[PDB]
Amino acid sequence: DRMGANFLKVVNQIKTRLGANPVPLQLAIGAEEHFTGVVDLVKMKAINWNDADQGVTFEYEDIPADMVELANEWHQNLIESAAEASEELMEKYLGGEELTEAEIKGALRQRVLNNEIILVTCGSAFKNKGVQAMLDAVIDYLPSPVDVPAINGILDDGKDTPAERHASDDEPFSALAFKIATDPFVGNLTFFRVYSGVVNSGDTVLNSVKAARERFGRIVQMHANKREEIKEVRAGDIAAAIGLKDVTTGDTLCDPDAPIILERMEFPEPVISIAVEPKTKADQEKMGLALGRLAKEDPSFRVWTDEESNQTIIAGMGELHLDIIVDRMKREFNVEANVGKPQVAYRETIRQKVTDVEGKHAKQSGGRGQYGHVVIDMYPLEPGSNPKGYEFINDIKGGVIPGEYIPAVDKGIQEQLKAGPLAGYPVVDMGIRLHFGSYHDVDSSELAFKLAASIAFKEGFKKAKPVLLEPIMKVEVETPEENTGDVIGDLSRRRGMLKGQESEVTGVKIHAEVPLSEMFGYATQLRSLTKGRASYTMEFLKYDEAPSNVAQAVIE
Amino acid sequence: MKVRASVKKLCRNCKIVKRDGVIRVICSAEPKHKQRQG
Amino acid sequence: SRVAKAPVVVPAGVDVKINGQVITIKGKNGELTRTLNDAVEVKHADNTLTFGPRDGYADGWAQAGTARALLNSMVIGVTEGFTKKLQLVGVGYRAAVKGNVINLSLGFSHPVDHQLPAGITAECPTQTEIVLKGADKQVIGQVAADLRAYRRPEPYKGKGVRYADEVVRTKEAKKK
Amino acid sequence: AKKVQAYVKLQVAAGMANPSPPVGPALGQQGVNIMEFCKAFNAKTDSIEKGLPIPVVITVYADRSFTFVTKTPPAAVLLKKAAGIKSGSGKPNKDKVGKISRAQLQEIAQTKAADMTGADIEAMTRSIEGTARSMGLVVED
RNA sequence: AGCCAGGAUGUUGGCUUAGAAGCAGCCAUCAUUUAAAGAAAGCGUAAUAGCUCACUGGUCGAGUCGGCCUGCGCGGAAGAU
Numbered sequence: 001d002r003m004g005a006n007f008l009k010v011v012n013q014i015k016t017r018l019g020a021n022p023v024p025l026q027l028a029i030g031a032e033e034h035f036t037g038v039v040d041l042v043k044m045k046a047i048n049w050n051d052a053d054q055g056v057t058f059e060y061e062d063i064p065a066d067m068v069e070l071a072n073e074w075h076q077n078l079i080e081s082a083a084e085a086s087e088e089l090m091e092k093y094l095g096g097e098e099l100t101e102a103e104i105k106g107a108l109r110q111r112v113l114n115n116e117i118i119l120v121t122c123g124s125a126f127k128n129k130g131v132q133a134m135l136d137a138v139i140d141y142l143p144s145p146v147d148v149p150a151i152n153g154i155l156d157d158g159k160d161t162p163a164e165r166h167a168s169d170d171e172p173f174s175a176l177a178f179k180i181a182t183d184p185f186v187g188n189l190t191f192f193r194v195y196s197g198v199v200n201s202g203d204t205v206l207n208s209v210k211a212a213r214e215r216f217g218r219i220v221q222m223h224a225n226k227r228e229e230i231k232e233v234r235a236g237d238i239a240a241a242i243g244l245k246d247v248t249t250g251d252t253l254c255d256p257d258a259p260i261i262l263e264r265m266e267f268p269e270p271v272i273s274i275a276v277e278p279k280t281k282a283d284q285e286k287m288g289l290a291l292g293r294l295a296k297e298d299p300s301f302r303v304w305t306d307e308e309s310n311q312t313i314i315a316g317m318g319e320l321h322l323d324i325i326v327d328r329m330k331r332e333f334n335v336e337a338n339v340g341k342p343q344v345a346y347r348e349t350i351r352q353k354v355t356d357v358e359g360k361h362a363k364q365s366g367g368r369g370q371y372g373h374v375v376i377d378m379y380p381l382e383p384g385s386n387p388k389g390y391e392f393i394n395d396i397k398g399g400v401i402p403g404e405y406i407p408a409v410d411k412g413i414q415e416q417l418k419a420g421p422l423a424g425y426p427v428v429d430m431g432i433r434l435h436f437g438s439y440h441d442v443d444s445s446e447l448a449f450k451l452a453a454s455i456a457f458k459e460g461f462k463k464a465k466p467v468l469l470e471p472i473m474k475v476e477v478e479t480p481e482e483n484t485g486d487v488i489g490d491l492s493r494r495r496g497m498l499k500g501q502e503s504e505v506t507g508v509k510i511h512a513e514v515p516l517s518e519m520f521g522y523a524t525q526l527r528s529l530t531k532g533r534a535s536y537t538m539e540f541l542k543y544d545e546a547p548s549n550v551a552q553a554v555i556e
Numbered sequence: 557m558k559v560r561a562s563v564k565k566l567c568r569n570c571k572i573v574k575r576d577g578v579i580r581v582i583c584s585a586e587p588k589h590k591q592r593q594g
Numbered sequence: 595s596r597v598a599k600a601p602v603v604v605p606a607g608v609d610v611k612i613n614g615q616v617i618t619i620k621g622k623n624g625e626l627t628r629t630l631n632d633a634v635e636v637k638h639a640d641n642t643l644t645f646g647p648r649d650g651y652a653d654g655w656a657q658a659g660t661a662r663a664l665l666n667s668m669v670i671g672v673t674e675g676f677t678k679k680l681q682l683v684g685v686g687y688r689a690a691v692k693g694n695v696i697n698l699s700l701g702f703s704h705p706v707d708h709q710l711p712a713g714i715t716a717e718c719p720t721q722t723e724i725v726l727k728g729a730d731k732q733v734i735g736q737v738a739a740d741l742r743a744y745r746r747p748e749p750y751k752g753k754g755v756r757y758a759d760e761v762v763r764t765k766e767a768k769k770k
Numbered sequence: 771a772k773k774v775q776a777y778v779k780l781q782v783a784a785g786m787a788n789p790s791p792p793v794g795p796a797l798g799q800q801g802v803n804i805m806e807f808c809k810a811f812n813a814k815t816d817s818i819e820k821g822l823p824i825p826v827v828i829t830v831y832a833d834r835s836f837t838f839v840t841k842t843p844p845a846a847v848l849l850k851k852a853a854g855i856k857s858g859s860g861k862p863n864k865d866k867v868g869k870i871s872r873a874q875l876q877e878i879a880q881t882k883a884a885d886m887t888g889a890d891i892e893a894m895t896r897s898i899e900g901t902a903r904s905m906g907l908v909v910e911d
Numbered sequence: 912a913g914c915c916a917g918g919a920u921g922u923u924g925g926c927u928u929a930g931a932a933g934c935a936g937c938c939a940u941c942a943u944u945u946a947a948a949g950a951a952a953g954c955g956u957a958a959u960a961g962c963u964c965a966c967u968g969g970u971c972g973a974g975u976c977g978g979c980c981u982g983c984g985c986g987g988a989a990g991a992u
Contacts, residue, residue: 003686489956501930578985798959846924857928886943
């Protein structure tokens with residue numbers, strides 16, 4: 001009931017883009033605003049709908065006079081669709097035996113077990129135009145659990161013997177576990193569907209793929225919202241297999257001494273990774289355990305937790321989900337989150353090299369004025385193979401500072417090497433040479449040279465432009481059309497180190513090397529480049545840098 | 557139409573015609589290159 | 595000049611009515627008259643029309659340089675005509691001709707149906723293509739440009755009403 | 771031969787079957803099956819040891835057709851195939867390394883004389899001396 | 912100044928080749944044919960396909976073009992019973 005809504009265009013657009021074979025049945029009457037009839041073509045009857053009511057009439061009439069010929073040229077393509085479905089209707093399309101409403105569906109229903117044609121219907125949901133029409137095809141074009149191939153439990157490891165079991169009540173019990181939601185009443189819940197067999201209330205239902213024992217509690221059905229306790233679950237209902245101790249994605253819900261499934265196909269990868277941070281330090285005690293009931297619900301929600309910084313780095317496949325699981329924490333889990341950046345190796349390096357920085361120390365701490373005017377020379381970040389991140393080349397002029405006071409200057413430099421003048425970014429792996437160490441007697445101690453060395457190191461960084469040693473990820477992107485030229489140009493805004501442009505039968509896969517420091521909102525940006533039309537991989541390879549030049553003014 | 561005292565022929569294909577007396581300069585594809593005063 | 599080296603040849607089938615300054619051209623399907631300025635010296639000499647700038651109005655080389663281009667278009671417009679097709683690229687936008695009226699499916703809360711004057715035989719082969727036919731070169735643009743000014747070419751999608759030969763410059767979002 | 775429709779000479783070393791991305795567009799001009807230009811030239815590509823850029827030209831036709839002209843590799847890459855390195859032009863008039871006499875230049879010009887009507891022997895001799903001086907190469911006989 | 916009009920074609924023009932493939936930028940800055948073509952100006956652009964400047968090669972068939980000096984003119988120019 002919208003402008004530009006041509007029914008015959010879209011069904012005949014599938015034969016061009018999707019490449020399928022749709023033969024539609026319920027056509028259109030009305031110029032989309034005075035629309036009143038939906039043209040079912042098997043029975044050749046138009047249906048009247050409600051003046052504006054939420055559901056009164058179903059009045060069937062004949063084909064109206066304003067579409068007496070388009071019904072003619074389209075019904076003859078309907079009755080084609082059984083002569084090339086079954087071989088037996090081939091000789092009565094041409095011989096001229098009558099192609100009734102009941103005879104043609106007996107061939108076309110068997111054309112849904114192979115799925116070469118889909119059955120299309122135009123109408124309105126909101127204007128109550130078509131919804132009462134759409135239900136009768138479901139019992140005649142959508143398959144039943146007893147008309148399909150039923151539960152097929154193979155074996156375990158012995159031999160590949162796929163066994164079609166019965167769809168009736170006369171089999172060992174069988175179900176599957178999916179849509180396993182949560183609740184603050186019982187904890188874990190499920191939305192499971194039983195394919196055949198009957199269970200009573202109270203059972204030792206196992207999960208036979210992961211070797212765990214569970215007991216079957218009080219099962220509850222819904223109107224999608226309201227608790228209705230379903231005691232006796234019949235073959236084919238959908239309910240809540242409650243009280244499972246541990247349960248994974250798609251394992252069996254089955255009594256022992258019975259057939260057994262072991263099947264988990266297409267385990268996904270949540271791609272976009274944002275790092276959640278608590279508000280109070282009482283929150284991390286309850287945000288460390290947030291992974292418990294949340295990640296148990298679904299495999300499209302991962303947490304790539306770090307090894308050092310101990311922040312909680314989540315992983316989603318869409319930020320649109322990483323919206324929601326924060327909002328799931330908000331009013332019911334009662335969490336105040338401060339969503340920030342993931343743990344990228346931010347090891348401050350150095351662009352410029354300071355010549356000499358003297359730590360100014362002068363204080364009568366221990367009686368006499370403990371001096372300590374020691375000077376260090378900013379040495380280039382030690383490269384190649386350097387296991388120790390602290391490379392203090394203590395160059396005492398003529399071994400002047402004694403061994404007792406060597407730890408002093410060492411400690412000061414080490415303290416600021418692990419710290420960072422930007423946001424506490426470790427200036428590690430940076431070799432540092434001592435220029436000259438002033439030494440005394442009553443004016444020589446630990447603080448004497450420790451405090452001095454501390455300031456000296458920081459002073460140097462202000463005139464050494466510390467940049468950022470950064471990890472580089474192997475980023476691949478799969479995009480079908482010639483819209484990747486805007487992508488790889490916009491990828492060139494982000495130091496994506498290009499490898500090559502390659503193609504597939506439908507996709508143009510681009511190969512690049514992107515800084516992990518330059519991830520930020522990568523997912524939401526390509527999703528506005530690719531329009532969300534992208535399915536690709538993420539790996540790691542090199543390690544490079546990302547521009548900072550913050551020592552100039554930003555760094556105090 | 558941006559206004560400034562200087563009409564400088566800036567774009568490579570920049571027409572200049574004196575409509576009403578005040579000069580306004582006519583590009584083809586760039587709307588940014590069109591001034592009006594001077 | 596170039597215009598002085600440009601005389602116009604009237605053919606058989608279009609009659610001129612030279613009452614000096616006022617010329618009313620009796621043509622094929624209309625009457626294309628222009629009451630020119632007094633900076634012209636007109637003479638349908640033998641068959642090919644010759645003109646002239648009057649003294650005093652020595653800037654009439656311009657004022658009749660309009661006229662030399664003018665009447666050439668008039669004798670070929672009253673007979674052959676102008677095809678002025680417009681391309682409607684709009685989401686749910688249609689075009690349909692009835693009598694001398696054009697509909698405008700233009701994304702509004704109310705329909706716009708404007709009546710179009712004489713010198714117009716409009717047509718519509720489809721909802722996005724619309725013919726206009728006419729005799730004056732002015733009137734075949736003036737009624738066309740009014741529609742285009744109701745929905746100018748949008749340079750972020752290519753949305754709008756646009757001419758057949760006109761080629762827009764659509765940009766990209768580049769931020770979000 | 772033909773006119774304002776299409777004429778570009780671009781092909782690089784024919785050991786690579788898949789059209790290299792920058793060459794792609796000269797095959798992305800008038801609607802080719804890119805498998806056809808892969809299957810046209812490989813019947814004669816097995817008479818070479820690959821490694822040099824061999825050139826072809828493209829030229830088009832009305833409906834879905836096309837055509838192409840096979841020649842021999844140019845002497846510009848033949849200068850830097852014998853010299854070992856493929857790129858020597860860092861400073862033209864300040865590098866004096868590497869000699870090949872005129873006798874090598876004419877025997878890579880007979881394969882031009884047996885292939886093409888331009889790029890003649892004696893006229894290209896100063897330009898095969900001219901691609902030497904820009905690369906920083908010497909010549910004596 | 913416009914319509915036909917080839918944009919004659921050696922080459923990938925390197926470097927560093929991931930594309931820096933005349934069209935990112937530094938050194939060369941020759942030209943196989945010179946009645947028409949430069950190892951080159953922008954747009955298309957990761958690169959190029961598309962579209963031109965280059966000579967207008969063929970038509971119009973006469974004047975035309977870019978700056979220097981002065982006579983004056985326009986814009987610049989918005990204020991408070």
